[PDB]
Amino acid sequence: YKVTLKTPSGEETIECPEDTYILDAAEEAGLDLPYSCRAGACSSCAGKVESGEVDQSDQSFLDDAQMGKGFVLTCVAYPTSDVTILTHQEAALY
Template identity: 40%
Template sequence: MKKITLLPQQKEFSIEEGQTILDAALEAGINYPNRCQVGACAMCLCKKLEGEIEYDLEPLLTDKEQQEGWVFACQATAKSDLVLLLE
């Protein structure tokens, strides 16, 4: 299991192998914004400050957005511990 730290709320939760960030947050009781859960509405968009993620299917993010650290939490899984910014 890996650990995710959500800033600025300073909330921490665990994520299992293959589980999406959004599913892990909701399972931990975190009120994480979401609507479609397929990467279309962008409500779950957050910024990765530390760590590595991966997607089964590449999200609709530009190369620049990905380089800036933007992540669709409903589609991303953790390859390492993560620090995410959700404002």
Template identity: 40%
Template sequence: MTKSHKIKIYDCQAGTEYTLQVPDDRYILHFAENQGVKLPFSCRNGACTTCAVRVKSGKIYQPEAVGLSQELRNQGYALLCVSYARSDLEVETQNEDEVYELQFGRYFAKGKVRFGLPLDED
């Protein structure tokens, strides 16, 4: 039996807030878009961090969020494009660059990737 949950989304970049009743068998982003809500997104596959949110309260289920480490999920981050509500939720959008840096920054700590030559040779 499908249940719906009250989802409050604060879009920090746009300074807007939305409240929706989202069925627990629908991706939150997709449902919000069908209701006319415009939120940040890019890949729609859970691989990037454009639609990242921070869960302020409630439970979210995101088995396909390959763009977020388990560590970031444990810290309350979620990707709306592949997330299902499991309770009433309050979430806020995040700065994509900050989340990307948290997720992938350790791999780029040595600076810009250059092809063909080692970094100390030009």
């Protein structure tokens, strides 16, 4: 799928298979998106989904309210469609 990342330094477009995490695809495309635990247990890789859908079932930090609002932990999220994500949204959680 095509993933459109709206990052502080600009928009980036990458290709990410349905069985690859968004963060992993971004790294393979030469981007340096933020992370820490890479295990769905913090909010360092948090973004916000603006279009499309993700599957982030292994995450455990976000509550249902936050996911409901579009928050995504990019280290454990697969795209299930083309997706637009606003990156660097950890602060928006607090």
